């Protein structure tokens, strides 16, 4: 039993990683799944596709590396954080598509909450802001949408779950229905204090206690999978965290004050707040993180819905680039957006604007503006956003980040990185590997099964490939922000209710 | 002497046309020139390039068709309407680049005017709105900008001119410095009532009477060119109108109530207002047009800076299409902008917004929005804009257009056309040839020299290739406008003063 295996269920792709005692990545496997947009502002996913893509990779990784089930010390699970799922207990057949995190359909409802005045309750018990972002709404919506539901849900013939959940469920064959705290913290049906399903909540959204799973800790054994190979040979499942949290962990930010920014589908900057929860005064999120070994901790989170995803759209949608010619490629061909600004409200906004009507937009178009400027402009949106939240965190946190700890594909983008640094007017530290996410789950489940005893051992696995120090001055720096901001406003409240 | 030749000096290209008594286009020639953008919101042109491209084509056309100077009954001149030029009398060497019409540099000044309260004077004597659009400002700017200027301009060692002017000047070798009324009407230094250089004006912008040319009528002989060929064989020059007006003419809109919309670099919808001038209550322009034979008339004009130019940018800038694959091609591949809106404030706005800070922008971006939607979205911007002005004209004019008379390349775009119709909720009539512009000058100069006696003869040259009748209903129609509008606002006052 020499390997930990991590299931990394992205927003965009299912991943699988093999890592050794040395916490090395032995092998990886990636499967993309369809981004479903039933309609503008909507985003779905096929549970099956998820499942399928994730199971398959899981196999592939082993496959490829001659590794046999029986060397799999255990399995860690990390996932895309809010997308909701509902399916028939008996069958396990979804009553409906996955309603992913970015999907803005709830919105309305959110207004009702708004209107009924739970701002506070919610915020004060969930740490959450009112948004279409979170599971609660989703669930409901489903229920509502799908006829018999509630009633059947009442007889819990119907089940609820986030991705970690669903996965597991499937890996165990119904055997186990569970989530972990990190995940649970985002449903907006779960008290992050009490640490239980929030009655009032369920009450409100009117969700059967019956469909929710057992919340558990991020590292622990929740069960096991049979994936053939040697007969009656099973694999323990013992790690579970929100991709975002999974990262902070892999990042070894197990101590309050430690923060990171993940450059993925969205930007996700989290700060450990130790064992203490932190109210956000700057429309930030307050949630559940991992203790130095997956215990309960807290964090401050800055959620930016549109980040690599951005990049991905210039590619697959705008078709303005390829896997051949990088965003960086071009971006660097010009020396500026030419005044251009991109506002990736592709999904509405969020931290800290938390608009759900704000929509994607370009500004400051000139006769001579080209792709490149566009490209770049895009690329910069990221840094921008980041800044926002960043700044915000300080506020809330009360801590100046002196350098930035980053992770996620995007971070490979030297340009971006630089800019980020400039723009921040802060060094930015780019590590050896961006899999921190997977690491985390690795770590986690690994820990949970002794594979490792503690982050200690691997305090030194962490390598700073590069650091970027600002090269722009306040003035300037403070200037561009200006437009960015200018722009930003222009995008909001776009969509019609 | 069997042919009239038209010099069509576009915003984007220099053209040349040969037409026979039958008013047929015998041959054409086109040369593109560089679009100069010294900086965002700026647009220049090289006088020489202009000149060069125009002279050369002029030759080419003849060349190509075995036509000899001596069959050229005469020459008509039509041009891009506001761009300003200033050059050394002696040398004819510009003291500075052409400051084309769209260039927003004046702006400021315009504010001063604003501030000093001439809204009215200006409007009431020039028919003009206060804008960076018009020559006045430009001139000044130059002067100011260029050291000795004023003083040298005072000794008129320095000359002023719009394109028709400059051309001529050159064709005659200094011999003649003249403009026509249409052109003059746009300087915003010229009384469209009095029909003279407006003292107050010059006063204001502080422009030496000394540099302005003699204003004359659109059809008349102002002189002649030597372009080799048979010895001492000259060609009379006898037609002069603003491309826009040149079109209305070619359009045979010599009678009040007659209007058209030109689908060119910009959209330009004009309405004949006969011998009577018309105040605009909906921020429209009041200007000089042609009488049934180039006499003075008036019109109502709707100026839309960004039209084909738009299309041209997706091509050369965005590179999102080609001469191979049409905007139409794609546009039609989707069924809607997907909610997207393009605001071609690439040059600020104008009729009727007359913003000069409004800048290019895209809105309503979604994860699934693609090129196409973009493309289209672009394409539709046109129709939109049009609508605006259209509606506005009625207001002012007090006349419902029952079908739309159109011209300019774009009009070939069935899509666009349809949309236009739908959107308008009005039939749109697309003629046989879009050269109406050139026609006009043809006509003009031809008339001026008897070649023809009057539009009468060619009342029947005009062929309706196609008509587009709406297929969208109010509701809908009135809906999309809504966003378009929504959008539109979001673009304004973008640029920083």
């Amino acid at each position: 039993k020499k390997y930990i295996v991590a299931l990394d269920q992205g927003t965009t792709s299912s991943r699988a990683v093999v890592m050794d005692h040395d916490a090395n990545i032995i092998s990886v496997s990636q499967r993309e799944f369809e981004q479903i947009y039933p309609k503008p502002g909507w985003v779905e996913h096929d549970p099956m596709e998820i499942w399928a893509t994730q199971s398959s990779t899981l196999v592939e990784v082993l496959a490829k590396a001659d590794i046999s089930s029986d060397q799999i010390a255990a399995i860690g699970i990390t996932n895309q954080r809010e997308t909701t799922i509902v399916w028939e207990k008996e069958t396990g057949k979804p009553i409906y598509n996955a309603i992913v995190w970015q999907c803005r359909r709830t919105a309305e409802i959110c207004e009702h909450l708004k209107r009924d005045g739970l701002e506070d309750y919610i915020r004060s018990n969930t740490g959450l802001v009112i948004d279409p972002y979170f599971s609660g709404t989703k669930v409901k919506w489903i229920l509502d949408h799908v006829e018999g539901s509630r009633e059947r849900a009442r007889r819990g013939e119907l089940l609820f779950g986030t991705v970690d959940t669903w996965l597991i469920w499937k890996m165990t064959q119904g055997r186990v229905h569970v989530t972990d705290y990190t995940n649970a913290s985002r449903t907006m049906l779960f008290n992050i204090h009490t640490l239980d399903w929030d009655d009032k909540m369920l009450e409100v959204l009117d969700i059967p206690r019956e469909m929710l799973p057992e919340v558990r800790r991020s590292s622990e054994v929740y069960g096991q999978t049979n994936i053939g190979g040697k007969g009656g040979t099973r694999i323990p499942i013992s790690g579970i965290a929100g991709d975002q949290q999974a990262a902070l962990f892999g990042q070894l930010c197990v101590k309050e004050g430690m923060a990171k920014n993940t450059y993925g589908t969205g930007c996700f900057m989290l700060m450990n707040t130790g064992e203490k929860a932190v109210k956000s005064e700057n429309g930030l999120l307050t949630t559940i993180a991992c203790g130095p070994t997956g215990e309960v901790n807290y964090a401050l989170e800055g959620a930016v819905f549109m980040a690599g995803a951005s990049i991905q759209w210039l590619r697959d949608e705008m078709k303005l680039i390829n896997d051949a010619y990088d965003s960086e490629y071009f971006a660097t061909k010009v020396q500026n957006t030419n005044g251009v600004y991109v506002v990736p409200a592709f999904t509405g906004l969020g931290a800290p604007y938390w608009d759900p009507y704000a929509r994607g937009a370009i500004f400051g178009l000139t006769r001579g503006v080209n792709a490149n400027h566009i490209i770049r402009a895009t690329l910069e949106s990221i840094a921008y956003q980041t800044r926002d939240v960043l700044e915000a965190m300080q506020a809330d946190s009360g801590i100046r980040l002196h350098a930035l700890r980053v992770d996620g594909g995007a971070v490979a983008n030297n340009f971006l990185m630089q800019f980020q640094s400039d723009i921040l007017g802060t060094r930015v530290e780019r590590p050896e590997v961006r899999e921190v996410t997977a690491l985390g789950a690795a770590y986690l489940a690994g820990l949970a099964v002794g594979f490792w005893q503690n982050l200690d051992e691997l305090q030194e696995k962490a390598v700073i490939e590069r650091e970027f120090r600002p090269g722009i001055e306040t003035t300037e720096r403070n200037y561009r922000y200006a437009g960015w901001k200018k722009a930003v406003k222009r995008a909001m409240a776009w969509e019609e209710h």
Side-chain angles (χ1 to χ4, degrees), chain A residues 23 72 78 84 100 123 130 177 200 202 207 231 286 297 300 321 355 366 401 417 419 443 448 459 477 492:
Chain A
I72 295 354
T78 188
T84 305
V100 354
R123 150 158 268 134
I130 300 212
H177 174 78
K200 178 164 223 170
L202 310 91
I207 311 223
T286 336
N297 259 27
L300 268 182
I321 76 211
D355 179 344
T366 297
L401 284 11
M417 290 301 90
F419 187 69
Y443 293 1
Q459 193 73 21
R477 170 172 76 260
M492 358 204 147

Side-chain angles (χ1 to χ4, degrees), chain A residues 80-99:
Chain A
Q80 36 139 330
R81 296 236 284 355
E82 283 80 355
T83 109
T84 305
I85 311 211
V86 169
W87 65 104
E88 284 176 355
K89 186 217 256 152
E90 328 295 354
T91 86
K93 126 174 349 197
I95 57 136
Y96 184 121
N97 236 22
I99 299 215

Side-chain angles (χ1 to χ4, degrees), chain A residues 372-409:
Chain A
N372 292 23
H373 316 98
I374 295 308
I375 301 212
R376 161 165 195 140
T378 279
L379 281 210
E380 326 181 323
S381 89
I382 298 142
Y384 283 105
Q385 257 151 335
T386 304
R387 188 145 133 197
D388 337 294
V389 304
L390 185 155
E391 329 223 295
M393 211 123 95
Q394 325 328 43
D396 272 348
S397 77
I399 328 214
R400 158 154 171 158
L401 284 11
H402 275 247
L404 231 226
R405 201 50 122 47
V406 309
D407 68 76

Side-chain angles (χ1 to χ4, degrees), chain A residues 182-197:
Chain A
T182 55
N183 274 122
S185 90
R186 321 224 127 216
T187 80
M188 190 203 15
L189 334 163
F190 171 105
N191 204 295
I192 51 133
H193 302 286
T194 267
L195 267 23
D196 199 36
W197 291 135

Side-chain angles (χ1 to χ4, degrees), chain A residues 11 60 151 250 264 289 310 314 324 336 394 403 414 461:
Chain A
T11 352
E60 208 181 316
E151 186 44 90
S310 297
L314 329 162
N336 45 42
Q394 325 328 43
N414 314 259
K461 263 256 95 78

Side-chain angles (χ1 to χ4, degrees), chain A residues 2 5 21 55 91 93 121 181 194 201 215 265 283 299 322 350 376 416-417 454 458-459 468:
Chain A
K2 10 184 137 184
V5 107
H21 203 255
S55 188
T91 86
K93 126 174 349 197
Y121 187 69
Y181 292 119
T194 267
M201 236 52 238
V215 193
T265 284
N322 11 207
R376 161 165 195 140
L416 202 221
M417 290 301 90
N454 53 29
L458 36 159
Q459 193 73 21
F468 307 85

